[PDB]
mmCIF file of C-alpha atoms in Angstrom:
data_model
loop_
_atom_site.group_PDB
_atom_site.id
_atom_site.type_symbol
_atom_site.label_atom_id
_atom_site.label_comp_id
_atom_site.label_asym_id
_atom_site.label_seq_id
_atom_site.Cartn_x
_atom_site.Cartn_y
_atom_site.Cartn_z
ATOM 1 C CA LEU A 72 -5.334 -60.344 13.098
ATOM 2 C CA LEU A 73 -7.341 -58.564 15.831
ATOM 3 C CA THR A 74 -9.699 -61.651 18.409
ATOM 4 C CA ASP A 75 -12.388 -59.405 20.253
ATOM 5 C CA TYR A 76 -12.420 -61.314 24.146
ATOM 6 C CA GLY A 77 -15.524 -59.002 24.761
ATOM 7 C CA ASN A 78 -18.306 -57.326 23.075
ATOM 8 C CA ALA A 79 -17.266 -54.733 20.625
ATOM 9 C CA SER A 80 -19.857 -54.518 18.702
ATOM 10 C CA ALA A 81 -22.057 -53.494 22.261
ATOM 11 C CA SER A 82 -19.655 -52.145 23.292
ATOM 12 C CA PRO A 83 -20.614 -48.611 24.696
ATOM 13 C CA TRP A 84 -17.530 -47.272 23.543
ATOM 14 C CA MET A 85 -18.340 -48.720 19.861
ATOM 15 C CA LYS A 86 -21.969 -46.425 20.231
ATOM 16 C CA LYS A 87 -19.345 -43.949 20.595
ATOM 17 C CA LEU A 88 -17.056 -44.169 17.953
ATOM 18 C CA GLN A 89 -20.341 -45.084 15.299
ATOM 19 C CA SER A 90 -21.711 -41.618 16.790
ATOM 20 C CA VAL A 91 -18.728 -39.845 15.976
ATOM 21 C CA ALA A 92 -18.631 -41.719 11.681
ATOM 22 C CA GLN A 93 -22.322 -39.146 11.433
ATOM 23 C CA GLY A 94 -20.200 -36.789 12.615
ATOM 24 C CA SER A 95 -22.470 -36.893 16.452
ATOM 25 C CA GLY A 96 -18.983 -33.640 17.026
ATOM 26 C CA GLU A 97 -17.927 -35.538 20.234
ATOM 27 C CA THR A 98 -14.228 -36.500 20.394
ATOM 28 C CA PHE A 99 -13.183 -40.179 20.205
ATOM 29 C CA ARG A 100 -10.147 -41.163 22.296
ATOM 30 C CA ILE A 101 -7.712 -43.234 22.190
ATOM 31 C CA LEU A 102 -5.079 -43.512 24.326
ATOM 32 C CA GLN A 103 -1.417 -45.652 24.067
ATOM 33 C CA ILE A 104 -0.001 -46.127 26.068
ATOM 34 C CA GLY A 105 3.537 -48.956 26.177
ATOM 35 C CA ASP A 106 6.722 -49.068 26.405
ATOM 36 C CA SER A 107 9.130 -46.881 22.972
ATOM 37 C CA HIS A 108 7.542 -48.012 19.993
ATOM 38 C CA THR A 109 4.755 -45.849 20.834
ATOM 39 C CA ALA A 110 8.052 -43.755 22.407
ATOM 40 C CA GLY A 111 8.600 -42.864 19.094
ATOM 41 C CA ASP A 112 5.507 -42.280 17.620
ATOM 42 C CA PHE A 113 5.954 -43.326 14.780
ATOM 43 C CA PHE A 114 3.324 -46.350 15.109
ATOM 44 C CA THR A 115 1.418 -44.248 17.078
ATOM 45 C CA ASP A 116 0.784 -41.089 14.718
ATOM 46 C CA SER A 117 1.078 -43.521 11.574
ATOM 47 C CA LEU A 118 -2.442 -44.498 13.463
ATOM 48 C CA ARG A 119 -3.411 -41.547 14.266
ATOM 49 C CA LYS A 120 -3.247 -40.071 10.333
ATOM 50 C CA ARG A 121 -5.725 -42.858 8.739
ATOM 51 C CA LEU A 122 -8.326 -42.554 11.248
ATOM 52 C CA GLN A 123 -8.296 -39.305 11.367
ATOM 53 C CA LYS A 124 -9.060 -39.206 7.606
ATOM 54 C CA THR A 125 -11.174 -41.923 8.096
ATOM 55 C CA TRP A 126 -13.681 -40.202 11.494
ATOM 56 C CA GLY A 127 -12.188 -37.227 11.888
ATOM 57 C CA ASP A 128 -9.222 -34.267 13.179
ATOM 58 C CA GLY A 129 -9.862 -34.274 16.457
ATOM 59 C CA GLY A 130 -7.229 -32.483 17.254
ATOM 60 C CA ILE A 131 -3.399 -33.890 18.798
ATOM 61 C CA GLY A 132 -4.810 -35.614 21.775
ATOM 62 C CA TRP A 133 -2.862 -35.241 24.551
ATOM 63 C CA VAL A 134 1.357 -34.334 23.951
ATOM 64 C CA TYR A 135 4.293 -33.784 26.074
ATOM 65 C CA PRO A 136 4.484 -31.263 28.478
ATOM 66 C CA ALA A 137 8.299 -29.982 27.010
ATOM 67 C CA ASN A 138 10.826 -31.981 24.666
ATOM 68 C CA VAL A 139 12.121 -35.651 26.214
ATOM 69 C CA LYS A 140 15.901 -37.199 25.569
ATOM 70 C CA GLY A 141 15.070 -40.682 22.927
ATOM 71 C CA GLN A 142 11.850 -39.721 22.418
ATOM 72 C CA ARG A 143 9.277 -37.857 19.935
ATOM 73 C CA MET A 144 5.759 -36.133 18.822
ATOM 74 C CA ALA A 145 4.792 -36.145 15.734
ATOM 75 C CA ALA A 146 1.773 -33.831 15.753
ATOM 76 C CA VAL A 147 3.952 -31.155 17.715
ATOM 77 C CA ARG A 148 6.761 -28.638 18.454
ATOM 78 C CA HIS A 149 7.999 -27.403 21.830
ATOM 79 C CA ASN A 150 9.984 -24.890 22.340
ATOM 80 C CA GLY A 151 10.637 -23.225 25.708
ATOM 81 C CA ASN A 152 12.864 -23.646 29.276
ATOM 82 C CA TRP A 153 10.694 -26.638 31.567
ATOM 83 C CA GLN A 154 12.445 -29.338 31.787
ATOM 84 C CA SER A 155 11.019 -33.066 31.436
ATOM 85 C CA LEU A 156 11.712 -35.923 33.878
ATOM 86 C CA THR A 157 10.287 -39.535 33.132
ATOM 87 C CA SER A 158 9.824 -42.206 35.145
ATOM 88 C CA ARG A 159 13.142 -44.315 32.383
ATOM 89 C CA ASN A 160 15.844 -43.696 34.970
ATOM 90 C CA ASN A 161 14.190 -41.948 37.535
ATOM 91 C CA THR A 162 12.043 -41.110 40.858
ATOM 92 C CA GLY A 163 9.604 -38.624 41.128
ATOM 93 C CA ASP A 164 5.554 -37.838 41.872
ATOM 94 C CA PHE A 165 4.547 -38.856 38.303
ATOM 95 C CA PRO A 166 1.487 -38.273 36.747
ATOM 96 C CA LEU A 167 0.045 -40.915 35.027
ATOM 97 C CA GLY A 168 2.405 -41.774 31.965
ATOM 98 C CA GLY A 169 6.068 -41.837 33.042
ATOM 99 C CA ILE A 170 6.094 -37.758 32.457
ATOM 100 C CA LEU A 171 6.597 -33.699 34.053
ATOM 101 C CA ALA A 172 8.515 -31.346 33.464
ATOM 102 C CA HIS A 173 9.557 -28.626 35.691
ATOM 103 C CA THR A 174 8.636 -25.596 34.470
ATOM 104 C CA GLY A 175 10.442 -23.213 37.269
ATOM 105 C CA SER A 176 10.378 -19.693 37.593
ATOM 106 C CA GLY A 177 9.880 -17.336 34.953
ATOM 107 C CA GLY A 178 9.384 -19.626 33.374
ATOM 108 C CA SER A 179 8.180 -20.393 29.457
ATOM 109 C CA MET A 180 6.996 -23.090 26.790
ATOM 110 C CA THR A 181 6.014 -22.674 23.460
ATOM 111 C CA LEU A 182 3.507 -26.449 20.812
ATOM 112 C CA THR A 183 3.814 -25.163 18.165
ATOM 113 C CA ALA A 184 1.927 -28.351 16.011
ATOM 114 C CA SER A 185 3.532 -29.143 12.412
ATOM 115 C CA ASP A 186 0.695 -28.538 11.027
ATOM 116 C CA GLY A 187 -2.890 -25.921 10.766
ATOM 117 C CA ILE A 188 -4.739 -25.583 13.412
ATOM 118 C CA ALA A 189 -6.387 -21.797 13.272
ATOM 119 C CA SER A 190 -8.985 -21.992 15.832
ATOM 120 C CA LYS A 191 -9.089 -21.158 19.406
ATOM 121 C CA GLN A 192 -8.961 -25.586 20.835
ATOM 122 C CA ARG A 193 -9.344 -27.414 23.953
ATOM 123 C CA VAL A 194 -6.220 -27.319 26.260
ATOM 124 C CA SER A 195 -6.465 -29.107 29.094
ATOM 125 C CA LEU A 196 -2.834 -29.464 31.422
ATOM 126 C CA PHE A 197 -1.964 -31.886 33.975
ATOM 127 C CA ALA A 198 -0.353 -29.751 36.024
ATOM 128 C CA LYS A 199 0.595 -29.631 40.349
ATOM 129 C CA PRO A 200 1.641 -26.071 41.477
ATOM 130 C CA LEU A 201 4.541 -25.376 44.767
ATOM 131 C CA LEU A 202 2.074 -23.396 45.997
ATOM 132 C CA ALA A 203 -2.286 -23.751 46.242
ATOM 133 C CA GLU A 204 -4.028 -20.968 44.671
ATOM 134 C CA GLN A 205 -0.811 -19.717 42.258
ATOM 135 C CA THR A 206 -1.667 -19.003 38.250
ATOM 136 C CA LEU A 207 0.207 -19.239 35.511
ATOM 137 C CA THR A 208 -1.401 -18.208 31.847
ATOM 138 C CA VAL A 209 -2.330 -19.517 29.116
ATOM 139 C CA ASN A 210 -2.120 -17.238 25.825
ATOM 140 C CA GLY A 211 -2.232 -14.582 28.355
ATOM 141 C CA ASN A 212 -4.917 -15.611 30.147
ATOM 142 C CA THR A 213 -4.893 -15.932 33.343
ATOM 143 C CA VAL A 214 -5.418 -20.194 34.361
ATOM 144 C CA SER A 215 -5.769 -20.529 38.012
ATOM 145 C CA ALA A 216 -5.029 -23.806 40.528
ATOM 146 C CA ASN A 217 -8.113 -24.671 43.145
ATOM 147 C CA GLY A 218 -5.743 -26.081 45.784
ATOM 148 C CA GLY A 219 -2.646 -27.640 45.803
ATOM 149 C CA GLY A 220 -1.838 -31.068 44.142
ATOM 150 C CA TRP A 221 -1.911 -32.754 40.718
ATOM 151 C CA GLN A 222 -5.106 -32.055 39.022
ATOM 152 C CA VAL A 223 -6.739 -30.597 35.360
ATOM 153 C CA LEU A 224 -6.567 -27.415 33.887
ATOM 154 C CA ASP A 225 -9.012 -27.028 32.402
ATOM 155 C CA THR A 226 -9.162 -23.747 29.439
ATOM 156 C CA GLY A 227 -8.844 -22.952 26.115
ATOM 157 C CA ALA A 228 -6.652 -21.153 23.248
ATOM 158 C CA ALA A 229 -5.156 -21.087 19.728
ATOM 159 C CA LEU A 230 -2.512 -22.947 18.332
ATOM 160 C CA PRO A 231 0.544 -22.067 18.869
ATOM 161 C CA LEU A 232 -0.045 -22.829 22.936
ATOM 162 C CA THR A 233 1.883 -20.580 25.255
ATOM 163 C CA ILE A 234 2.335 -21.293 28.670
ATOM 164 C CA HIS A 235 4.428 -18.862 31.322
ATOM 165 C CA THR A 236 4.647 -19.860 34.545
ATOM 166 C CA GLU A 237 5.900 -17.067 37.133
ATOM 167 C CA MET A 238 6.858 -20.234 39.944
ATOM 168 C CA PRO A 239 7.547 -22.545 40.004
ATOM 169 C CA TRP A 240 4.956 -25.594 38.191
ATOM 170 C CA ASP A 241 5.020 -29.215 37.504
ATOM 171 C CA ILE A 242 3.578 -30.177 33.806
ATOM 172 C CA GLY A 243 2.168 -33.489 33.185
ATOM 173 C CA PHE A 244 0.600 -34.038 30.014
ATOM 174 C CA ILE A 245 -1.330 -31.879 28.259
ATOM 175 C CA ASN A 246 -5.051 -31.826 25.790
ATOM 176 C CA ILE A 247 -5.183 -29.980 22.535
ATOM 177 C CA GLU A 248 -8.323 -31.671 21.049
ATOM 178 C CA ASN A 249 -10.493 -29.350 17.359
ATOM 179 C CA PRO A 250 -14.384 -28.375 19.472
ATOM 180 C CA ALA A 251 -15.644 -29.861 15.828
ATOM 181 C CA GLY A 252 -15.084 -33.216 17.267
ATOM 182 C CA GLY A 253 -13.742 -36.271 16.082
ATOM 183 C CA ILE A 254 -10.849 -38.761 16.780
ATOM 184 C CA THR A 255 -8.204 -38.313 19.316
ATOM 185 C CA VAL A 256 -4.556 -41.043 19.798
ATOM 186 C CA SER A 257 -2.565 -39.968 22.281
ATOM 187 C CA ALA A 258 1.157 -41.497 23.074
ATOM 188 C CA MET A 259 2.356 -42.394 26.208
ATOM 189 C CA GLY A 260 5.393 -44.166 25.941
ATOM 190 C CA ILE A 261 8.181 -45.147 28.089
ATOM 191 C CA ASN A 262 11.334 -46.461 26.127
ATOM 192 C CA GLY A 263 12.159 -50.208 27.403
ATOM 193 C CA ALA A 264 9.466 -49.585 30.033
ATOM 194 C CA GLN A 265 6.735 -52.259 31.293
ATOM 195 C CA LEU A 266 4.012 -53.052 32.110
ATOM 196 C CA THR A 267 4.150 -53.491 35.433
ATOM 197 C CA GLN A 268 6.220 -50.210 35.830
ATOM 198 C CA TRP A 269 3.246 -47.967 35.849
ATOM 199 C CA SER A 270 4.024 -49.117 40.548
ATOM 200 C CA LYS A 271 6.288 -46.300 39.502
ATOM 201 C CA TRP A 272 4.026 -43.558 38.502
ATOM 202 C CA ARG A 273 1.953 -41.597 41.353
ATOM 203 C CA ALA A 274 -0.133 -43.574 43.802
ATOM 204 C CA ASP A 275 -3.853 -41.818 42.029
ATOM 205 C CA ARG A 276 -2.790 -43.076 38.686
ATOM 206 C CA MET A 277 -5.822 -44.900 37.848
ATOM 207 C CA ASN A 278 -7.923 -40.881 39.208
ATOM 208 C CA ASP A 279 -5.398 -39.463 36.170
ATOM 209 C CA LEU A 280 -6.684 -42.227 33.236
ATOM 210 C CA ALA A 281 -9.984 -41.100 34.104
ATOM 211 C CA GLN A 282 -9.636 -38.401 33.220
ATOM 212 C CA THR A 283 -8.245 -38.913 30.196
ATOM 213 C CA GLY A 284 -11.428 -39.294 28.761
ATOM 214 C CA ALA A 285 -10.098 -41.662 26.539
ATOM 215 C CA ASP A 286 -12.799 -44.447 25.072
ATOM 216 C CA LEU A 287 -9.881 -46.880 23.660
ATOM 217 C CA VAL A 288 -6.755 -47.490 25.974
ATOM 218 C CA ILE A 289 -4.440 -49.430 23.641
ATOM 219 C CA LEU A 290 -1.983 -51.092 25.534
ATOM 220 C CA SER A 291 1.528 -52.238 24.289
ATOM 221 C CA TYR A 292 4.447 -53.927 26.070
ATOM 222 C CA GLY A 293 5.431 -56.760 26.342
ATOM 223 C CA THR A 294 8.874 -56.472 23.910
ATOM 224 C CA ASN A 295 11.347 -55.909 27.398
ATOM 225 C CA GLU A 296 8.481 -58.211 30.300
ATOM 226 C CA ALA A 297 10.204 -61.154 27.041
ATOM 227 C CA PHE A 298 14.109 -59.030 27.890
ATOM 228 C CA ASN A 299 14.002 -60.657 31.574
ATOM 229 C CA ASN A 300 15.280 -64.060 31.391
ATOM 230 C CA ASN A 301 14.455 -64.535 34.443
ATOM 231 C CA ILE A 302 11.025 -62.888 34.583
ATOM 232 C CA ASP A 303 7.345 -64.638 36.736
ATOM 233 C CA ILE A 304 5.252 -66.160 33.981
ATOM 234 C CA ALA A 305 2.267 -66.555 36.563
ATOM 235 C CA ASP A 306 2.115 -63.725 38.594
ATOM 236 C CA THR A 307 3.112 -61.735 35.242
ATOM 237 C CA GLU A 308 -0.003 -62.807 34.669
ATOM 238 C CA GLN A 309 -2.054 -61.652 37.544
ATOM 239 C CA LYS A 310 -0.154 -57.985 37.771
ATOM 240 C CA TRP A 311 -0.808 -57.456 34.221
ATOM 241 C CA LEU A 312 -4.783 -58.470 35.658
ATOM 242 C CA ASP A 313 -4.874 -56.800 37.529
ATOM 243 C CA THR A 314 -4.399 -54.021 35.613
ATOM 244 C CA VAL A 315 -6.255 -54.466 33.196
ATOM 245 C CA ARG A 316 -9.008 -54.771 36.430
ATOM 246 C CA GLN A 317 -8.640 -51.383 36.925
ATOM 247 C CA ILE A 318 -8.655 -49.557 33.469
ATOM 248 C CA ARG A 319 -11.896 -51.272 33.572
ATOM 249 C CA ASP A 320 -12.870 -49.348 37.780
ATOM 250 C CA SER A 321 -11.870 -46.147 36.395
ATOM 251 C CA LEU A 322 -12.718 -46.330 32.664
ATOM 252 C CA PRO A 323 -16.185 -48.230 32.851
ATOM 253 C CA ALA A 324 -16.698 -47.320 29.461
ATOM 254 C CA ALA A 325 -13.948 -47.592 27.634
ATOM 255 C CA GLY A 326 -12.118 -50.410 25.047
ATOM 256 C CA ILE A 327 -8.622 -52.205 25.550
ATOM 257 C CA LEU A 328 -6.816 -53.074 23.196
ATOM 258 C CA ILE A 329 -3.964 -55.737 24.295
ATOM 259 C CA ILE A 330 -1.496 -55.211 21.930
ATOM 260 C CA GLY A 331 0.726 -58.428 22.210
ATOM 261 C CA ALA A 332 4.468 -57.780 21.368
ATOM 262 C CA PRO A 333 5.950 -58.222 17.998
ATOM 263 C CA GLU A 334 8.785 -60.570 17.350
ATOM 264 C CA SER A 335 12.665 -59.942 18.335
ATOM 265 C CA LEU A 336 15.057 -61.118 17.670
ATOM 266 C CA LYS A 337 17.581 -61.113 20.175
ATOM 267 C CA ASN A 338 20.470 -61.627 17.573
ATOM 268 C CA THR A 339 20.300 -61.511 14.225
ATOM 269 C CA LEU A 340 22.848 -63.780 13.734
ATOM 270 C CA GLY A 341 21.440 -66.777 11.134
ATOM 271 C CA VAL A 342 18.956 -66.582 8.533
ATOM 272 C CA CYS A 343 15.579 -66.376 11.048
ATOM 273 C CA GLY A 344 16.534 -66.981 14.568
ATOM 274 C CA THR A 345 17.058 -65.856 17.656
ATOM 275 C CA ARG A 346 14.512 -65.310 19.451
ATOM 276 C CA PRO A 347 13.921 -64.379 23.393
ATOM 277 C CA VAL A 348 13.724 -66.502 25.514
ATOM 278 C CA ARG A 349 11.023 -65.738 27.922
ATOM 279 C CA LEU A 350 9.236 -63.754 24.267
ATOM 280 C CA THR A 351 6.564 -67.177 23.305
ATOM 281 C CA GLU A 352 5.580 -66.836 26.714
ATOM 282 C CA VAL A 353 5.101 -63.672 27.609
ATOM 283 C CA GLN A 354 3.010 -63.574 23.825
ATOM 284 C CA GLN A 355 1.275 -65.994 25.033
ATOM 285 C CA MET A 356 0.464 -64.557 28.359
ATOM 286 C CA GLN A 357 -0.421 -61.335 27.109
ATOM 287 C CA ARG A 358 -3.093 -63.372 24.731
ATOM 288 C CA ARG A 359 -4.343 -64.946 28.397
ATOM 289 C CA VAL A 360 -4.924 -61.802 29.357
ATOM 290 C CA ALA A 361 -6.740 -60.255 27.373
ATOM 291 C CA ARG A 362 -9.344 -62.939 26.412
ATOM 292 C CA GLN A 363 -10.120 -63.564 30.784
ATOM 293 C CA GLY A 364 -9.938 -59.768 30.464
ATOM 294 C CA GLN A 365 -12.808 -59.551 28.239
ATOM 295 C CA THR A 366 -10.283 -56.851 26.006
ATOM 296 C CA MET A 367 -9.433 -57.177 21.862
ATOM 297 C CA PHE A 368 -5.934 -58.744 21.189
ATOM 298 C CA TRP A 369 -3.925 -57.353 18.421
ATOM 299 C CA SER A 370 -1.344 -60.233 17.312
ATOM 300 C CA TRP A 371 2.287 -57.632 15.551
ATOM 301 C CA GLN A 372 3.844 -61.137 15.393
ATOM 302 C CA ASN A 373 1.174 -62.699 13.285
ATOM 303 C CA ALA A 374 0.723 -59.486 11.485
ATOM 304 C CA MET A 375 4.253 -59.828 10.773
ATOM 305 C CA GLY A 376 4.106 -63.024 9.335
ATOM 306 C CA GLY A 377 3.991 -65.082 12.317
ATOM 307 C CA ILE A 378 7.039 -66.368 13.988
ATOM 308 C CA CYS A 379 10.407 -66.637 12.323
ATOM 309 C CA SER A 380 9.790 -63.696 10.489
ATOM 310 C CA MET A 381 11.877 -59.933 12.334
ATOM 311 C CA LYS A 382 14.649 -61.332 10.080
ATOM 312 C CA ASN A 383 13.019 -60.720 6.437
ATOM 313 C CA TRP A 384 11.410 -57.171 7.885
ATOM 314 C CA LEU A 385 14.727 -56.304 8.999
ATOM 315 C CA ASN A 386 15.997 -57.482 5.719
ATOM 316 C CA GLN A 387 13.118 -55.896 3.813
ATOM 317 C CA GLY A 388 14.077 -52.277 5.191
ATOM 318 C CA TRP A 389 10.542 -52.437 7.615
ATOM 319 C CA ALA A 390 12.984 -53.238 10.046
ATOM 320 C CA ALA A 391 15.765 -51.723 12.940
ATOM 321 C CA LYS A 392 19.548 -52.948 11.973
ATOM 322 C CA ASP A 393 18.914 -54.257 16.371
ATOM 323 C CA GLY A 394 16.503 -57.085 15.067
ATOM 324 C CA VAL A 395 13.732 -55.461 17.872
ATOM 325 C CA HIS A 396 13.190 -51.512 17.190
ATOM 326 C CA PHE A 397 11.491 -50.480 13.393
ATOM 327 C CA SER A 398 12.410 -48.345 10.683
ATOM 328 C CA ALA A 399 9.724 -45.740 10.230
ATOM 329 C CA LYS A 400 8.363 -46.784 7.398
ATOM 330 C CA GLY A 401 8.327 -50.345 9.668
ATOM 331 C CA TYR A 402 6.369 -49.298 11.785
ATOM 332 C CA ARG A 403 3.980 -46.796 9.294
ATOM 333 C CA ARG A 404 3.730 -50.694 7.695
ATOM 334 C CA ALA A 405 2.357 -52.436 11.061
ATOM 335 C CA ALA A 406 0.600 -49.284 12.554
ATOM 336 C CA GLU A 407 -1.816 -49.944 9.436
ATOM 337 C CA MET A 408 -2.439 -53.339 9.559
ATOM 338 C CA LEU A 409 -3.833 -52.057 12.932
ATOM 339 C CA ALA A 410 -5.585 -49.362 11.806
ATOM 340 C CA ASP A 411 -7.553 -51.790 8.561
ATOM 341 C CA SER A 412 -8.228 -54.430 11.843
ATOM 342 C CA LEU A 413 -10.070 -51.254 13.764
ATOM 343 C CA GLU A 414 -12.360 -50.594 10.117
ATOM 344 C CA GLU A 415 -12.433 -53.689 9.711
ATOM 345 C CA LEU A 416 -14.285 -54.017 13.419
ATOM 346 C CA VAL A 417 -16.159 -51.162 13.091
ATOM 347 C CA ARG A 418 -17.173 -51.758 9.767
ATOM 348 C CA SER A 419 -18.955 -55.180 10.921
ATOM 349 C CA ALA A 420 -21.692 -53.387 13.382
#
């Protein structure tokens, strides 16, 4: 299921994960960026709870600044007055990930962890203040910008977290990491997104990517590319290759895992089919990019039983009625196979 077209065992990130597994106390950061399967958080949260039991709870990682309509965070509940906006249907000066929230004046947001937390955690925010040296507060502590523009505010707090803004700010993702180290899985999804649609994000998005501190980037797209009957594979392959090349430029020390689209059905009509017309070209392309870019490739379709399997998963309650999206227990099944593959790769070093 997992093919390594690079050199996993020799990699700097491998060495970091190993070090964390003995309890170096560092944080190993997994950042999954992708479409609806990522945006729902069922895949990533299942992945999170497993790799955290295996190698340590590093915290929730990077989460939304506010509720995002039709999208989901599993590790935090949001309660407040900020208004989110995403690159899905809209234009905006987006930080990496396509999500921001307007705090407005006298704004307020509380993040409460679905489980237990206790102590001070490391907190980091993508933020952009209206005025240059502006402030907000985090559990009552004044936290200050330096100059204007998008930037990362480094602070510390315990959960639950309350962020007060007297005057307007735009807030991106928020990082929340356990100081004792371990693993974080961060879900940066947009419903319906394609990998090339990072272009909708601000020009410095890669400078944001470098700041996420990710040690392993999981790129999970392909489903909606496959739904464009008129997609141009060669050009798409170039832009995909360019994205891999740029991730490597600004995250020189990270692993890259490309998850090939799972089987989707244009029609659940008839036993087996019918697949989208361009699904196989897309799937194949994703593997070519993985090998040329020397990345890891995990075949979601092969994890399902290969071709003509989505109908099986549909019948078994693993997939949603539409034949594209999965059920919550369907995603848990997929992600667990991936976690399997990962631990398998690690143990073999």
